[PDB]
Curated annotation (Swiss-Prot), chain A:
Residues 95-106 are annotated as: Interphase loop. Belongs to the MT-A70-like family. The chain holds residues 368 to 574 of 580 of the full protein. Keywords: Acetylation, Biological rhythms, Cytoplasm, Differentiation, DNA damage, Immunity, Innate immunity, Isopeptide bond, Methyltransferase, Nucleus, Oogenesis, Phosphoprotein, RNA-binding, S-adenosyl-L-methionine, Spermatogenesis, Transferase, Ubl conjugation. This is N(6)-adenosine-methyltransferase catalytic subunit METTL3. The record marks 71, 74 as: Interaction with METTL14. It comes from Homo sapiens.
From Swiss-Prot, chain B:
It is found in: Nucleus. Belongs to the MT-A70-like family. One of its GO terms (molecular function) is mRNA binding. The gene is METTL14. Changing residue 68 to A: Does not affect methyltransferase activity of the heterodimer complex formed with METTL3. Residues 107-116 are annotated as: Positively charged region required for RNA-binding. This is N(6)-adenosine-methyltransferase non-catalytic subunit METTL14. Heterodimer; heterodimerizes with METTL3 to form an antiparallel heterodimer that constitutes an active methyltransferase. Component of the WMM complex, a N6-methyltransferase complex composed of a catalytic subcomplex, named MAC, and of an associated subcomplex, named MACOM. The MAC subcomplex is composed of METTL3 and METTL14. The MACOM subcomplex is composed of WTAP, ZC3H13, CBLL1/HAKAI, VIRMA, and, in some cases of RBM15 (RBM15 or RBM15B). The METTL3-METTL14 heterodimer forms a N6-methyltransferase complex that methylates adenosine residues at the N(6) position of some mRNAs and regulates the circadian clock, differentiation of embryonic stem cells and cortical neurogenesis. In the heterodimer formed with METTL3, METTL14 constitutes the RNA-binding scaffold that recognizes the substrate rather than the catalytic core. N6-methyladenosine (m6A), which takes place at the 5'-[AG]GAC-3' consensus sites of some mRNAs, plays a role in mRNA stability and processing. The record marks 104, 107 as: Interaction with METTL3. Its main location: nucleus. It comes from Homo sapiens (Human). GO terms for cellular component: nucleoplasm; nucleus; RNA N6-methyladenosine methyltransferase complex.
Amino acid sequence: LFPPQWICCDIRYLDVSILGKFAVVMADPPWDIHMELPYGTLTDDEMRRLNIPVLQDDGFLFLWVTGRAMELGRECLNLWGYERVDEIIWVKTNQLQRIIHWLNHGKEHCLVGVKGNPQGFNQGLDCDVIVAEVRSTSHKPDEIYGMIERLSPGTRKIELFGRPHNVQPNWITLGNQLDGIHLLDPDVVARFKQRYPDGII
Amino acid sequence: NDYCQHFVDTGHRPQNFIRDVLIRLKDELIAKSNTPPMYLQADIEAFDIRELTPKFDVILLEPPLEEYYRKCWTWDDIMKLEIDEIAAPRSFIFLWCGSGEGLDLGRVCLRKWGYRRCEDICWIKTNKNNPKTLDPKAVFQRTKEHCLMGIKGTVDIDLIITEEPEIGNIEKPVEIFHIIEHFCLGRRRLHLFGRDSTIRPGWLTVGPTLTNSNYNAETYASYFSAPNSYLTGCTEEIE
Ligand SMILES: O=C(NC[C@@]1(O)CCCN(c2cc(NCc3ccccc3)ncn2)C1)c1ccc(CN2CC3(CCC3)[C@@H]2C2CC2)cc1
């Protein structure tokens, strides 16, 4: 069911087995980056234990990383069964197309992992650099959804730790700041009721 | 404006549309402090790295990867280099990793040699003068290279933007030297797999293709004997 769907939840506790399989997974997790926390973080062990493996058989994972999550995210990627095969960087600009530790940071990193043997994707249509204006804090650029749609048009996708502005057609968004539960795919609706009969996780 | 859709439409990479892409006394203090250029032809595969002394404050490591040419060094070869044996206990490394498996295997190398990664410097290549073949595992067109900065022991941005060089030109942007020298990390600076074309004041260059050498370990050490042993490379010379 093409139109946007979402589930307000804590991704630590939701049973993701009810959601089926996805051609693309994207996650922007609250890594514990050993700094002061404007939000609740997930410990390294909780990140490792995320039930990412049930979400795909053949497809791609897009994993946003920063700081020491550049290394921890690689570990998680491999533990979950992915091989890292690309790394997208988003060059942050203003409206005048100018670029906004030891070095100032002009960019954000998104690892690209592959699992299984995906077939029928459009590899090589886009390049691995994104140039786009910064919106709110912690807000990724909408260009990534277009690159992902050109790479895998029309397939089912799931975003973890999304925010309400992230909800898109063909995507199911999971995040703890979304507005209730909104599901339209009948297979998902069935398994959700069966697994959560009283609508609580 | 969606520069990714624009790339799909026209072949202009999104980085083509970045615009604009004084610490001048620092540059002169660096120039004043720089040792004479020194360089040594050496087949690093067959060469006892421990002959290079004293231990270095900065190492720039630029192994010739096969992906640069589409004698190459594999990550197997690179990982077996004994870099920890020539690095000072507090020191830095800048490792050019390419854009493929090196982003992973270069991090393994860093940890194997005792460093932690502190910065990921991305060389972003524009194609303004020619709006690509693909590695089998690639999902996207690869338009950048990464240089990882590692630290062991106790003004610039992490981006370099230049036009993609002509095919077969394997040179990395000279801007990497500016970034490194502006950190003021110390004066014992080593460039492994440098070339005649990269030799530079303030640096010792060691590589197989060098046509001449002037390296002498005693002469080199004498540039850093007292009172000059702990200069950052960004201060005045001691009278
Ligand atoms: O965390 C975060 N923003 C709070 C939420 O609320 C919001 C909405 C869903 N989020 C959740 C979180 C959750 N468990 C967390 C939890 C732990 C302990 C107690 C309570 C809750 N379960 C379901 N959705 C998290 C968060 C996570 C990552 C980043 C940074 N990236 C933004 C980035 C994208 C480009 C720039 C950058 C990236 C590295 C490159 C910024 C903020």
